[PDB]
Amino acid sequence: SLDLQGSIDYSTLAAGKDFGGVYSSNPLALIRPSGADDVARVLKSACRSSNLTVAARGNGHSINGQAMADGGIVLDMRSTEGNHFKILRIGDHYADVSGGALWEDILMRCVSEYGLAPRSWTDYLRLTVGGTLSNAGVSGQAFRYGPQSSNVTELDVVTGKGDFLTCSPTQNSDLFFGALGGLGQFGVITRARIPLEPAPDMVRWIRMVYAEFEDFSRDAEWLVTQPEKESFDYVEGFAFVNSDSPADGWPSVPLNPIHSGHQLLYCLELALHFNHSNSSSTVDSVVKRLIGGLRYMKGFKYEVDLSYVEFVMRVKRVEEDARAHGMWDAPHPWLNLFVSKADIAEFDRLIFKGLLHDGVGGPMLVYPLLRSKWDSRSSVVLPEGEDEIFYIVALLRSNPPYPKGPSVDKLVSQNDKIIQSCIQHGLGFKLYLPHYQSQHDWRRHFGDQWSKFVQLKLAFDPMAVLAPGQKIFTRRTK
Numbered sequence: 001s002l003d004l005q006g007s008i009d010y011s012t013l014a015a016g017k018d019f020g021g022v023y024s025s026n027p028l029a030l031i032r033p034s035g036a037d038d039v040a041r042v043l044k045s046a047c048r049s050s051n052l053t054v055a056a057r058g059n060g061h062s063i064n065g066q067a068m069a070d071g072g073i074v075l076d077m078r079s080t081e082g083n084h085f086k087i088l089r090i091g092d093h094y095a096d097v098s099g100g101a102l103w104e105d106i107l108m109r110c111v112s113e114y115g116l117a118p119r120s121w122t123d124y125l126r127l128t129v130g131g132t133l134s135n136a137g138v139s140g141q142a143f144r145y146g147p148q149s150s151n152v153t154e155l156d157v158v159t160g161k162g163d164f165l166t167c168s169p170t171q172n173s174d175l176f177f178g179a180l181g182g183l184g185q186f187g188v189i190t191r192a193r194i195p196l197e198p199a200p201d202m203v204r205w206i207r208m209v210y211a212e213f214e215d216f217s218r219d220a221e222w223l224v225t226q227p228e229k230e231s232f233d234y235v236e237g238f239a240f241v242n243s244d245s246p247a248d249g250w251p252s253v254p255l256n257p258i259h260s261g262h263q264l265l266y267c268l269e270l271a272l273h274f275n276h277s278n279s280s281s282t283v284d285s286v287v288k289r290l291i292g293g294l295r296y297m298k299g300f301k302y303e304v305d306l307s308y309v310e311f312v313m314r315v316k317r318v319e320e321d322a323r324a325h326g327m328w329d330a331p332h333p334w335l336n337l338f339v340s341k342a343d344i345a346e347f348d349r350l351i352f353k354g355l356l357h358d359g360v361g362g363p364m365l366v367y368p369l370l371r372s373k374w375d376s377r378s379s380v381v382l383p384e385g386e387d388e389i390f391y392i393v394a395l396l397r398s399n400p401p402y403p404k405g406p407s408v409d410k411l412v413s414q415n416d417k418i419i420q421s422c423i424q425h426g427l428g429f430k431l432y433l434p435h436y437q438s439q440h441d442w443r444r445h446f447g448d449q450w451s452k453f454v455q456l457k458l459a460f461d462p463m464a465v466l467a468p469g470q471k472i473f474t475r476r477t478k
């Protein structure tokens with residue numbers, strides 16, 4: 001039986017808002033669950049109601065209201081963030097972590113308490129375990145280890161019916177694989193067990209500028225396809241504007257220019273783990289071998305050494321900056337997508353060069369991934385193709401709020417135009433963090449994976465109580 005009191009221990013949380021600032025909602029209530037028991041109690045009660053919906057909120061970083069429950073119940077999963085933490089040995093190591101824990105705190109705790117760390121990250125660490133595992137969780141390690149959803153050995157899940165189940169690849173495996181990349185549709189992740197690696201002492205962080213997309217992409221693909229023993233430990237890249245803009249021009253590139261008609265340029269971003277047992281000269285020798293033959297513009301290679309924790313935490317500086325400029329609690333109509341290797345050059349021509357040649361005010365990430373690291377059994381949707389290589393693209397728009405900058409309607413319209421152009425060109429792409437309004441568009445997104453997705457919904461959340469903000473299924477009555 002669900003027993004609740006007024007929240008005393010907690011600061012105000014705007015449960016009807018998220019990072020995107022595109023939508024707003026008015027939940028009936030915000031609940032701070034103590035742990036999995038409370039989550040189950042809440043979902044069991046929701047199932048008995050005629051039409052209550054429940055959204056589990058991670059850290060509110062959705063763009064499109066995915067963690068909202070207008071006229072429903074929001075669970076603050078961070079109130080469970082301390083639950084379950086442990087490190088165990090089998091001599092491989094694992095961590096149990098709460099679904100509501102921030103990746104930032106997992107990094108700090110694992111490194112400081114055990115000299116260990118997760119091996120697959122997001123760029124930004126104030127995201128929750130459950131939140132990223134429900135999507136994928138992608139950064140520069142994914143070419144080696146796969147996304148965070150490919151680095152899980154166990155989940156505790158409370159289903160939309162309110163049932164608690166421990167799941168793995170071999171136990172309640174339909175739920176396990178369904179929840180991974182499953183957009184919160186089948187249950188609330190209350191615990192994950194994840195592999196850990198010995199934490200590196202240090203990182204050599206490198207950025208190299210490219211004039212042309214062909215050179216950039218060929219070199220990026222080369223670097224993610226080398227033997228593990230002779231490879232970097234992180235590969236990303238981004239297009240930036242050939243301008244003096246502090247937001248997304250040349251100032252955004254160095255870690256601590258040639259005058260040309262280029263509208264955009266490209267930056268290949270690499271990192272090499274090393275330990276204090278390695279001399280600077282040794283690291284130099286390794287890097288020199290690894291980048292032999294690369295066609296980056298001479299004179300525009302930037303390098304710094306920093307601790308592993310500082311490198312994984314590198315985006316904290318960006319948040320501090322934004323917050324100091326009152327730009328954090330503002331709209332961010334970001335667009336994220338996966339593009340097939342076969343179509344990435346046309347995507348660059350049509351979208352980067354064609355539509356975005358003046359930039360979007362923030363990073364335009366683009367870098368290759370390896371399909372073999374993305375578990376085909378999961379709910380993740382990738383574009384068709386069987387090139388081992390595919391790409392992720394992220395358009396991290398940043399603008400002063402209206403009327404100083406464009407309206408949210410305007411920006412969303414621009415995002416729609418990008419997607420429209422890809423569709424009209426028949427490009428092989430899928431949205432990451434997908435958002436659609438009609439189920440017809442959702443069926444187009446899932447393609448031949450749709451039947452399985454609905455089957456899982458019927459098995460685990462038949463009344464569609466859970467994650468209504470994804471707008472895939474509507475709440476059934478009674």
Ligand SMILES: *Cc1cc2c(cc1C)nc1c(=O)[nH]c(=O)nc-1n2C[C@H](O)[C@H](O)[C@H](O)COP(=O)(O)OP(=O)(O)OC[C@H]1O[C@@H](n2cnc3c(N)ncnc32)[C@H](O)[C@@H]1O
Binds near residue numbers: 066121
């Ligand atoms: C805001 C932001 C997001 C972001 C990022 C940088 C910033 C500043 N960098 C990313 C990166 O480098 N790589 C990547 O893959 N994602 C990145 N993101 C996006 C982030 O992944 C998403 O915002 C994602 O949603 C995680 O954020 P968060 O943890 O805050 O979760 P949420 O937005 O509130 O909820 C997402 C959906 O999942 C459901 N949900 C939430 N918690 C659970 C649990 N425990 N179990 C089951 N479902 C859950 C929500 O209801 C919602 O549908």
Ligand SMILES: [N+]
Binds near residue numbers: 287
């Ligand atoms: N070097």
